[PDB]
């Protein structure tokens, strides 16, 4: 599309500039163009892709939650009828959010996942696939909702299976995946006990492996372990 005429390296450079300027929509567009060049992504480039889209969709999701709460209050008994505007605007934001999720899922399917052979890259992309199906699930209310939830679950499960076989329990990708799959269990799959069990087991297995790490790797792993602990404290 619109990035077809720009060099791959220039798209990456501009994605980094967009990140510095907090222009995440631009950053995502540059990284989409880079993916569409057809070459595999490096570790740094995968990070840029994920940062860009997680910030774009994160803003859409926060807006959707504001509007959904307003809409829910409007449907409470005793609430005045204010017309279709709240629903219409929530639907507009929702459709835009779904479009971005579909875009990310499309990049993963064409053709990031199929070309990813190393454990790190494959787990990273499968985690992303689970996340963007999870974001679709947050807004789903219809007849494909169960299939959206199962698509998230299946992607997370494959990522977990690979990560357990091929990566140490302190690996930041493995840890972030487990954090997100635990959130999936808690608030999407209605399985709080599974969420708590996964967070605890992940935390404890990482703790036991910290002794193998350099100071810098220790800092990276413990940062994500603290997120797991934050959720355990909230949930128990």
């Amino acid at each position: 599309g619109a990035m077809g005429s720009m060099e791959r390296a220039s798209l990456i450079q501009k994605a980094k500039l967009a990140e510095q300027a907090e222009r995440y929509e631009d950053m995502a567009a540059f990284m989409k163009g880079a993916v569409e060049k057809g070459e595999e992504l490096s570790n740094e480039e995968r990070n840029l892709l994920s940062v860009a889209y997680k910030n774009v969709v994160g803003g859409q999701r926060a807006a959707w939650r504001v509007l959904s709460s307003i809409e829910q209050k409007s449907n409470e008994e005793g609430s005045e009828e204010k017309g279709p505007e709240v629903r219409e605007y929530r639907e507009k934001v929702e459709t835009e959010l779904q479009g971005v999720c579909d875009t990310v899922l499309g990049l993963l399917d064409s053709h990031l996942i199929k070309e990813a052979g190393d454990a790190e890259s494959r787990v990273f992309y499968l985690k992303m696939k689970g996340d963007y199906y999870r974001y679709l699930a947050e807004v789903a209310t219809g007849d494909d909702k169960k299939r959206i939830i199962d698509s998230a679950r299946s992607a997370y499960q494959e990522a977990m299976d690979i990560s357990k076989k091929e990566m140490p329990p302190t690996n930041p990708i493995r840890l972030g995946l487990a954090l997100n799959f635990s959130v999936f269990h808690y608030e999407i799959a209605n399985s709080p006990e599974e969420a708590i069990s996964l967070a605890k087991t992940t935390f404890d297995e990482a703790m036991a492996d910290l002794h193998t790490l350099s100071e810098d790797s220790y800092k990276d792993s413990t940062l994500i372990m603290q997120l797991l602990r934050d959720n355990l404290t909230l949930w128990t």
Binding site: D131, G176, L227, L234
Partner: peptide, 8 residues
């Protein structure tokens, strides 16, 4: 307090 997912 909102639960954490994998974010900065």
């Amino acid at each position: 307090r909102r639960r954490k997912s994998c974010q900065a």
